[PDB]
């Protein structure tokens, strides 16, 4: 979906010229009565790599924030500031743990995603190493709700759709774990 909107960046500068778009900045911070929070610094690739680990670790805070939105009756952005900060800190903690326990496996995964159009199906080898490392060091398991445990696509042995071009770093790391970990 590449529909032009007034809420984000459009397709080309000709659209900006026709719309006379002004990219407006604000130099004012949040008022002091709202406690400050540390924003998440992960880009698109690390966030997609850690999406299921944030959900597993921060499920109760994700639900509580979203339940606050529904029960606010239209006043979600203002009322649920407190619940929003809980999610931001919890999500940051997951990324901090990934940089202290599984940095090599974590970086291997989202760099594969940047190499393969950010598609999960093209980085199974790197994801499997990452999933094993996170479970053994954080007790967090990727789970896809609504389907039986053995019918998860990320655990499929012989997928119909496979990446066209292999990721060399993923291939080398996968072989280093096949022979060593599984003697």
């Amino acid at each position: 979906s590449s529909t032009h909107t007034n809420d984000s960046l459009n397709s080309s500068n000709y659209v900006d010229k026709l719309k006379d778009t002004h990219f407006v900045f604000e130099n004012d911070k949040l008022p002091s009565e709202i406690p400050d929070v540390e924003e998440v610094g992960a880009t698109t690739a690390p966030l997609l790599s850690a999406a299921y680990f944030i959900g597993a670790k921060c499920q109760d805070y994700n639900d509580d924030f979203m339940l606050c939105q529904k029960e606010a009756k239209g006043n979600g952005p203002i009322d649920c500031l407190k619940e929003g900060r809980r999610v931001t800190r919890c999500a940051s903690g997951v990324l901090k743990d990934l940089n202290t326990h599984c940095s090599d496996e974590f970086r291997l995964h989202w760099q594969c995603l940047s190499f393969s159009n950010l598609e999960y199906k093209n980085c199974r080898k790197a994801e499997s190493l990452l999933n094993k490392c996170v479970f053994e060091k954080m007790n967090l398991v990727k789970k896809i709700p609504g389907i039986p445990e053995d019918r998860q696509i990320h655990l499929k042995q012989n997928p119909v759709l496979k990446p066209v071009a292999l990721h060399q770093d993923s291939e080398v790391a996968f072989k280093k774990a096949q022979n060593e970990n599984s003697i």
């Binding site: 979906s1 590449s2 007034n6 984000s8 960046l9 698109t44 190499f115 159009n117």
Partner: protein, 149 residues
């Protein structure tokens, strides 16, 4: 008997596709990777001694609205629409560098300048009749008059 002279033009046509594919696959990938290194030209061009092997980012396709939001968010974090960063905490500058596009909502130029397309009973009323605007100005006037109470 395979006539090799008839296959010479096909080999050149084969090289024609390869010229486009070789240049596009490599130059576009290199440009994205170079701009993801940092916010300044001293990092994009110069490679540090302690930096590891270069990891390339391939071009993105089949995007949606979420990817447009991600591209702007990555710009405010790395200075590139596809910048790379796995930091747990963002910089203080990320708090106040948000970008909000403000634009006009006027009708297309062809709708209001075509010699034929701009003529209709309702368009004439909008353009030449004050009946709609006089009534709608009441709502604008009611806003200021209801402040003092």
């Amino acid at each position: 008997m395979i006539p090799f002279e008839a296959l010479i033009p096909y080999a050149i046509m084969f090289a024609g596709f390869c010229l486009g594919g070789g240049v596009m696959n490599s130059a576009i990938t290199a440009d994205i990777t170079k701009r993801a290194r940092g916010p300044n030209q001293e990092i994009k061009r110069n490679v540090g001694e302690d930096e590891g092997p270069r990891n390339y980012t391939k071009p993105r396709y089949n995007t949606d609205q979420w990817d447009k939001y991600f591209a702007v968010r990555d710009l405010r974090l790395t200075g590139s629409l596809r910048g790379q960063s796995d930091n747990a905490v963002a910089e203080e500058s990320f708090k106040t560098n948000s970008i909000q596009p403000y634009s006009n909502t006027r009708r297309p130029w062809v709708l209001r300048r075509h010699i034929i397309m701009k003529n209709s009973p309702t368009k004439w009323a909008r353009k030449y009749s004050s009946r709609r605007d006089e009534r709608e100005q009441e709502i604008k006037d009611d806003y200021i008059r209801g402040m003092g109470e």
